[PDB]
Design an enzyme around this catalytic site. Structure first.
Site, PDB file in Angstrom:
ATOM      1  N   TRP A  64       0.832  -1.204   0.000  1.00  8.50           N
ATOM      2  CA  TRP A  64       0.000   0.000   0.000  1.00  8.50           C
ATOM      3  C   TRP A  64       0.868   1.256   0.000  1.00  8.50           C
ATOM      4  O   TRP A  64       1.578   1.524   0.973  1.00  8.50           O
ATOM      5  CB  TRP A  64      -0.900   0.019   1.245  1.00  8.50           C
ATOM      6  CG  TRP A  64      -2.100  -0.865   1.149  1.00  8.50           C
ATOM      7  CD1 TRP A  64      -3.295  -0.561   0.562  1.00  8.50           C
ATOM      8  CD2 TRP A  64      -2.209  -2.212   1.615  1.00  8.50           C
ATOM      9  NE1 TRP A  64      -4.146  -1.638   0.629  1.00  8.50           N
ATOM     10  CE2 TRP A  64      -3.507  -2.670   1.267  1.00  8.50           C
ATOM     11  CE3 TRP A  64      -1.341  -3.087   2.288  1.00  8.50           C
ATOM     12  CZ2 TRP A  64      -3.957  -3.961   1.570  1.00  8.50           C
ATOM     13  CZ3 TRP A  64      -1.787  -4.375   2.592  1.00  8.50           C
ATOM     14  CH2 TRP A  64      -3.087  -4.799   2.229  1.00  8.50           C
ATOM     15  N   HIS A  93      -7.255   2.034   2.572  1.00  4.06           N
ATOM     16  CA  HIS A  93      -8.335   1.135   2.192  1.00  4.06           C
ATOM     17  C   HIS A  93      -9.357   1.334   3.290  1.00  4.06           C
ATOM     18  O   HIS A  93      -9.073   2.034   4.261  1.00  4.06           O
ATOM     19  CB  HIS A  93      -7.870  -0.320   2.154  1.00  4.06           C
ATOM     20  CG  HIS A  93      -7.125  -0.743   3.376  1.00  4.06           C
ATOM     21  ND1 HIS A  93      -6.540  -1.984   3.497  1.00  4.06           N
ATOM     22  CD2 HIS A  93      -6.840  -0.075   4.522  1.00  4.06           C
ATOM     23  CE1 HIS A  93      -5.922  -2.064   4.665  1.00  4.06           C
ATOM     24  NE2 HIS A  93      -6.089  -0.920   5.306  1.00  4.06           N
ATOM     25  N   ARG A 119      -4.222   6.348  -2.315  1.00  9.41           N
ATOM     26  CA  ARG A 119      -2.997   5.605  -2.583  1.00  9.41           C
ATOM     27  C   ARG A 119      -2.050   6.467  -3.426  1.00  9.41           C
ATOM     28  O   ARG A 119      -2.472   7.099  -4.394  1.00  9.41           O
ATOM     29  CB  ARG A 119      -3.330   4.316  -3.336  1.00  9.41           C
ATOM     30  CG  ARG A 119      -2.951   3.060  -2.596  1.00  9.41           C
ATOM     31  CD  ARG A 119      -3.749   1.885  -3.097  1.00  9.41           C
ATOM     32  NE  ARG A 119      -4.607   1.310  -2.061  1.00  9.41           N
ATOM     33  CZ  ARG A 119      -5.206   0.122  -2.162  1.00  9.41           C
ATOM     34  NH1 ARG A 119      -5.036  -0.616  -3.250  1.00  9.41           N
ATOM     35  NH2 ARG A 119      -5.988  -0.330  -1.184  1.00  9.41           N
ATOM     36  N   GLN A 133     -13.883   2.375  -2.229  1.00  6.19           N
ATOM     37  CA  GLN A 133     -13.945   0.943  -2.001  1.00  6.19           C
ATOM     38  C   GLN A 133     -15.204   0.713  -1.170  1.00  6.19           C
ATOM     39  O   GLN A 133     -15.803   1.664  -0.639  1.00  6.19           O
ATOM     40  CB  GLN A 133     -12.751   0.491  -1.172  1.00  6.19           C
ATOM     41  CG  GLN A 133     -11.506   0.065  -1.868  1.00  6.19           C
ATOM     42  CD  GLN A 133     -10.441  -0.527  -0.958  1.00  6.19           C
ATOM     43  OE1 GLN A 133     -10.572  -0.375   0.287  1.00  6.19           O
ATOM     44  NE2 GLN A 133      -9.438  -1.180  -1.493  1.00  6.19           N
ATOM     45  N   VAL A 176      -6.500 -11.747   6.917  1.00  5.98           N
ATOM     46  CA  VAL A 176      -7.410 -12.878   6.685  1.00  5.98           C
ATOM     47  C   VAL A 176      -6.697 -14.151   6.246  1.00  5.98           C
ATOM     48  O   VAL A 176      -5.802 -14.141   5.382  1.00  5.98           O
ATOM     49  CB  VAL A 176      -8.533 -12.598   5.619  1.00  5.98           C
ATOM     50  CG1 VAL A 176      -9.513 -11.557   6.130  1.00  5.98           C
ATOM     51  CG2 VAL A 176      -7.921 -12.193   4.299  1.00  5.98           C
ATOM     52  N   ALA A 229     -14.725 -11.009   5.864  1.00  8.30           N
ATOM     53  CA  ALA A 229     -14.782  -9.639   5.431  1.00  8.30           C
ATOM     54  C   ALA A 229     -14.347  -9.662   3.990  1.00  8.30           C
ATOM     55  O   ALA A 229     -13.694 -10.616   3.566  1.00  8.30           O
ATOM     56  CB  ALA A 229     -13.832  -8.798   6.254  1.00  8.30           C
TER      57      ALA A 229
HETATM   58  N1  LIG Z   1      -9.665  -3.406   1.276  1.00  9.35           N
HETATM   59  C1  LIG Z   1      -8.758  -4.557   0.926  1.00  9.35           C
HETATM   60  C2  LIG Z   1      -9.636  -5.671   0.241  1.00  9.35           C
HETATM   61  C3  LIG Z   1      -9.979  -6.800   1.200  1.00  9.35           C
HETATM   62  C4  LIG Z   1     -10.891  -6.620   2.241  1.00  9.35           C
HETATM   63  C5  LIG Z   1     -11.148  -7.649   3.155  1.00  9.35           C
HETATM   64  C6  LIG Z   1     -10.502  -8.875   3.049  1.00  9.35           C
HETATM   65  C7  LIG Z   1      -9.578  -9.073   2.022  1.00  9.35           C
HETATM   66  C8  LIG Z   1      -9.329  -8.026   1.105  1.00  9.35           C
HETATM   67  C9  LIG Z   1      -7.625  -4.156   0.024  1.00  9.35           C
HETATM   68  O1  LIG Z   1      -7.111  -3.077   0.218  1.00  9.35           O
HETATM   69  O2  LIG Z   1      -7.236  -4.764  -0.822  1.00  9.35           O
END
Ligand SMILES: N[C@@H](Cc1ccccc1)C(=O)O
Ligand SMILES: N[C@@H](Cc1ccccc1)C(=O)O
Ligand SMILES: [Mg+2]
EC number: 6.1.1.20
Lengths: 265, 775, 233
Positions: A64, A93, A119, A133, A176, A229
């Site tokens: 990021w 994000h 970003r 997003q 995750v 999520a």
């Molecule tokens: N917001 C995340 C996307 C994501 C959300 C939740 C679980 C996995 C991926 C990203 O920046 O990529």
């Protein structure tokens, strides 16, 4: 009298395509019991990175490109109105909201989080530095991946289909495990669209939450609960949906463009 | 249905209290609309017996000599007043409900009345008031305060649904409470009957109307007033005691939902005949009303030799003549099951709704007749010392109910509960069902008094109510909906977005009745309504609105008369009815218009309404335009049809003045469309960066010609690069042809890929001017 | 997950009564004071655009839609049906002849009463609460067994509000549906599925909610009244 004549020049308003798309997506998840809530565009490195299993000096933080901020007298509010610390930046994000919400609430629940993110990147026909997003989070005892799968599947149907379908491939995210990226089947244009990422909320994230809660005096609520999520890029979808060709077009306040979506609904 | 606690308690002894009872009933499916206390009897009123009744000469009064402990006199005007009965005597000093004036010793007509005997109306136990309460001469020891034998009571005003006819009987309810775990006490009908033959015959000539019919025989009757407890219960039930015999038929009818009538044998002749009435037959019914019969009316008649005469109106009300009185010593007892529909027809056919009629209509236990006869005869033997024959006259053998298949598992599956099989059976069994089978599916035969029990599901509703609806858990279903249900919401949604936009644009929404005054089909120049009511609410709402606007305008008026709004802008979406039901949308404008309040000018009128209209479509992304059109209800010249995106739907215009005035109303502006609005799926289109070609241009054409065609032509000839086309001005104009006008047209052009070369501009410009007035 | 869909205000005695276990000459038909209609050339459309027959009338409740929807679709599903209904009655401060109801129907294999219970419970919470609650009492309806009436707990005003009726869709209703479907050429879809439906009076609730005192007020096009709800949202 000549009735075919033009009437009093009255102003006909319209809505921004992102707003429309956002709206549409929201109405969709709302039908599955998801509730919409927003977070702050200016966040703390803590909520943006640390809370979610994102390390400082390791390869993850390096996915990021963040905008760092500076300035004094700026008060950043935590999930409970408290003042929090950490290097300031622009939410990279919408995931940080995942945390703020959990710290502030009790499972089980279903939320969805629209929001503008930032970003550091060079702006071209399909890449922006400023975009939106839509994060999604569903926590509760018993939650499993099949739920996420169905979730996304319902979303597909809602957008195209019932002749459309979903693709789930494993991918890596610090917050995750299992992690995955998902694509959607577009019957019309005939191609696979990579939509966003999702997965089962990481244990260290839950850990973080509870830890901060107690530091705030609250009792732990995320021990023994599960959750998934997901998050998807809105502009991309809006472009495919409303048939727009240049992503730069959205932040380019040109009217001839904006009006084109007057009656979208 | 009135429900006297104490009376019901006679079958369900363990009742905790009226409140708990109200509770228990609510749960079984019976809602209490009211609860009441009822028999407050001050110490002043006491039991007294009429030793003597002497009439006062020259007057229509009698001096009664009473035994109230010490002897005493009162003067009464009541006709039923006579020696040999027990009466309610309110002594001087007694405070009564009715009279705010205390009871005293008044001299009446040469005689000083010590207090006064009472009517039910006076004692407050009933509505009657047209005679004294009559009691068994020996009910109590003269003087004993009445409250001693007549305690206040608590009555529940219950609501018995049509599916529970068995509940029109207190014993029906008792059976239900019993199902909850309460102890039930069925009344035992003890009877000493005799062998002898019935002195009459029975002939059922219309078995369709009288599926089941029984006759009882009792003789050697001592007709007298009913015992206190009975009078009490009947009075509490909202019924009025007559004599022990009649009273009995009522008591039992209220006990089991089984109406029955006792006919004095004096008037029966050779026998009873259940048959339809002969055209024009006459019958003085019980209520003293003389009536004429219709041939569909089933009736209970008798016959002597070759004589057939009506005795009572089958299952509704008896004849006034045959009715039981003091001098009756033998009668025949009607206990039957009549066909609901005939009763319904016949009942409503004349102005009647009796306790009997009501029950028979809702349905009577097909096999309750005989046990009911035993119950009644037993009571007679006891209260009228009747001698009863052991035999009955019966007509029609009805069939028993059949077994209903029942799966306990399914029950649970359906409720979303987990009751153990045994618990379920136990319940059904407590409700009087027979349960055969070993499981998992059982053979359940319901008791005949239960008519609402036919399917397995009916059976489940039972376990549920008995277990308690509150014992059912809470849950939420999860499933992927069948595909054909996908889009479904669209229409509704579409209508609402529209509804919303309007309000946001500046329109007040309004709701109007779907009714229409046939007269307005005239008042407002429009065709007549295709649909009319057969039972209109009022002749002014006897039709179905074909148009929305009439109602709007009408609203306008009434608003002006109540409050005086300077201007008004609103709309309404509703269903109109022509050859097909249709969803219409109309809007009305009126008033000074918009502009500066203080500052002089306003801008309103028709072109205002249009202004808004156009903006609306601008917001919906739909192409709309108007073209003059002749409309019967619209002022011409200010009339015009409406063209949404290339289509003709609805109209727009100024309300024809003839109507404007036919109503105390000034000028109004309208429009009414048909929904749903068609929709143009957007086709996005990249706008070019290369600057546009600007132009100044005017057109001179006849004063009649419509803007339309003008714009139309100019536009259709402009070429494929015409970006914009607007009108910034026009006037008739001194400097030009008397019958022509000028047109300020601003023009713009652009080319996507590159800039427009002037070669093509002043060129295409002529492409227009040429065919412009070349036409 | 309920989806909104509307029906016609002018219905056929078939969809309004017959389809739902409502008899002609029995006490049930007698719970709804209906407005009968007359007139020719009026075309009433069935669930599939076909023309249907039966004495015309004004929908007495929104339940008929239950049928039209089922005939036209396949389970499982969740629908809700708002709509203006008509009853022949004398218009007073709390009673109208013209008013609105909201019907709800959820059919699918496995559906049970607990679902209905939760459904309503969620509704309560949504309106008042989470300090509010629900009351379910048994009641009788020809198109549902078990049948029930439900009240809701209003924490603020402190009383129980009878909201509407509900229950498990009656077998003869499902039967009806399939029967008409086949008569229309379609294969049966409601054998072996369960379902619950409910319906509630809207005006009542609106009055309690927005604090209105006279039900007549709604069809009384007075502006001073209507405007009072300008910014309600
Ligand atoms: N917001 C995340 C996307 C994501 C959300 C939740 C679980 C996995 C991926 C990203 O920046 O990529
Ligand atoms: N609309 C029904 C209410 C209801 C709907 C569904 C099931 C039960 C009751 C009525 O007229 O009363
Ligand atoms: Mg039942």
């Amino acid at each position: 009298v000549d009735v075919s004549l033009p009437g009093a020049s009255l102003f006909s308003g319209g809505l921004h395509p992102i707003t429309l798309m956002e709206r549409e997506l929201v109405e969709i998840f709302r039908a599955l019991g998801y509730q919409a809530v927003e977070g702050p565009e200016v966040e703390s490195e803590f909520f943006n990175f640390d809370a979610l299993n994102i390390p400082e000096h390791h390869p993850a933080r390096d996915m990021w490109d963040t905008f760092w901020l500076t300035g004094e007298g700026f008060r950043l509010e935590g999930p409970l109105g408290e003042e929090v610390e950490g290097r300031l930046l622009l939410r990279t994000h919408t995931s940080p909201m995942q945390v703020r919400y959990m710290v502030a609430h009790t499972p089980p629940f279903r939320i969805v989080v629209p929001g503008r993110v930032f970003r550091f990147e060079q702006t071209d026909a399909t890449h922006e530095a400023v975009f939106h997003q839509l994060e999604g989070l569903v926590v509760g005892e018993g939650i499993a991946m099949a739920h996420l799968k169905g979730a996304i599947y319902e979303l597909a149907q809602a957008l195209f289909g019932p002749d459309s379908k979903v693709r789930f491939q494993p991918v890596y995210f610090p917050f995750v495990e299992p992690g995955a990226q998902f694509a959607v089947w577009w019957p019309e244009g005939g191609k696979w669209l990579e939509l966003g990422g999702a997965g089962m909320v990481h244990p260290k994230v839950f850990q973080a939450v509870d830890a901060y809660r107690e530091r705030l005096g609250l009792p732990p609520a995320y021990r023994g609960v599960t959750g998934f999520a997901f998050g998807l890029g809105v502009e991309r979808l809006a472009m495919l949906r409303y048939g727009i060709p240049d992503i730069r077009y959205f932040f380019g306040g040109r009217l001839k463009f904006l009006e084109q979506f007057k009656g979208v609904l | 249905m009135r429900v006297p606690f104490s009376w019901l308690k006679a079958y369900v002894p363990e009742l905790e209290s009226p409140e708990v009872l109200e509770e228990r009933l609510a749960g079984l499916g019976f809602e209490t609309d009211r609860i009441e206390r009822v028999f407050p009897i001050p110490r002043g009123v006491v039991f007294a017996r009429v030793l003597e009744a002497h009439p006062i000469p020259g007057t229509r009064l009698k001096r009664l000599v009473l035994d109230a402990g010490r002897t005493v006199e009162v003067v009464s005007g009541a006709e039923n007043a006579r020696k040999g009965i027990g009466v309610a005597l309110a002594l001087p000093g007694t405070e009564l409900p009715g009279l705010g004036q205390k009871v005293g010793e008044r001299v009446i007509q040469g005689v000083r009345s010590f207090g006064m005997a009472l009517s039910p109306r006076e004692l407050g136990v009933g509505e009657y008031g047209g005679g004294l309460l009559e009691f068994p001469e020996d009910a109590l020891p003269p003087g004993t305060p009445l409250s001693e034998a007549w305690p206040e009571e608590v009555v529940l005003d219950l609501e018995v649904t049509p599916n529970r006819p068995d509940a029109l009987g207190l014993l029906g309810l008792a059976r239900d409470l019993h199902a909850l775990g309460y102890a039930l006490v069925e009344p035992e009908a003890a009877l000493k009957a005799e062998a002898l033959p019935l002195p009459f015959a029975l002939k059922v000539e219309d078995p369709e109307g009288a599926p089941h019919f029984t006759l009882g025989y009792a003789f050697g009757l001592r007709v007298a007033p009913s015992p206190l407890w009975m009078q009490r219960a009947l009075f509490a039930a909202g019924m009025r005691p007559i004599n022990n015999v009649v009273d009995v038929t009522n008591y039992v009818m209220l006990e089991r939902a089984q109406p029955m009538h006792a006919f004095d044998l004096r008037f029966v002749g050779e026998g009873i005949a259940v048959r339809r009435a002969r055209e024009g037959e006459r019958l003085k019914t019980l209520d003293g009303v003389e009536r004429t019969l219709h041939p569909e009316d089933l009736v209970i008649a008798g016959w002597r030799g070759e004589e057939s005469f009506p005795l009572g109106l089958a299952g509704v009300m008896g004849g006034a003549e045959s009715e039981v009185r003091e001098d009756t010593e033998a009668i025949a007892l009607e206990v039957a099951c009549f066909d609901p529909v005939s009763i319904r027809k016949t009942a409503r056919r004349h102005g009647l709704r009796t306790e009997a009629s009501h029950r028979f209509e809702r349905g009577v236990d097909p096999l309750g007749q005989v046990p009911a006869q035993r119950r009644a005869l037993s009571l007679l033997q006891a209260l009228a010392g009747a001698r009863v024959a052991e035999a009955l006259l019966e007509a029609g053998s009805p069939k028993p109910p059949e077994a209903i298949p029942f799966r306990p598992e399914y029950a649970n599956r359906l409720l979303g509960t987990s009751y153990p099989e045994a618990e379920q059976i136990a319940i059904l069994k407590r409700l009087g069902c027979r349960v055969e089978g070993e499981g998992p599916t059982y053979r359940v035969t319901p008791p005949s008094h239960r008519l609402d029990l036919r399917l397995e599901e009916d059976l489940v509703e039972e376990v549920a109510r008995i277990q308690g609806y509150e014992t059912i858990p809470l849950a939420l279903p999860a499933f992927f909906p069948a595909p054909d249900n996908r889009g479904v919401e669209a229409p509704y949604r579409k209508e609402q977005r529209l509804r919303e936009v309007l309000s946001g644009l500046g329109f007040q929404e309004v709701y109007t009745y779907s009714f229409m005054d046939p007269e307005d089909a005239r008042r407002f120049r429009l065709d007549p309504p295709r649909l009319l009511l057969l039972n209109p609410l009022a002749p002014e709402k006897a039709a179905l609105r074909t148009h929305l606007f009439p109602g709007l305008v009408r609203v306008l008026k009434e608003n002006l008369d109540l409050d005086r709004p300077e201007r008004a802008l609103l709309f309404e979406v509703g269903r109109v009815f022509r050859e097909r039901e249709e969803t219409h949308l109309a809007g009305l404008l009126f008033g000074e218009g918009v502009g500066l309040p203080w500052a002089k000018e306003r801008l309103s009128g028709y072109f205002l309404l249009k202004g808004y209209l156009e903006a609306l479509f601008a917001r919906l992304g739909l192409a709309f335009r108007v073209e003059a059109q002749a409309f019967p209800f619209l002022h011409p010249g200010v009339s015009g049809r409406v063209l949404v995106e290339g289509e003709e739907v609805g109209f727009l215009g100024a309300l024809h003045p003839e109507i404007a005035q036919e109503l105390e109303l000034p000028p109004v502006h309208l429009f009414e469309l048909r929904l749903p609005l068609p929709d143009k799926p957007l086709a996005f289109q990249d706008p070019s960066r290369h600057p546009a070609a600007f132009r100044d241009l005017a057109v001179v054409v006849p004063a009649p010609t419509p803007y339309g065609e003008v714009e139309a032509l100019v536009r259709e000839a402009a070429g494929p690069y015409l970006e914009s086309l607007a009108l910034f001005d026009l006037y008739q104009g001194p400097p030009l042809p008397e019958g022509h006008k000028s047109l300020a047209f601003h023009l713009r052009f652009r080319h996507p890929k590159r800039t427009l070369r002037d070669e093509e501009v002043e060129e295409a410009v002529s492409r227009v001017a040429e065919a412009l007035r070349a036409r």
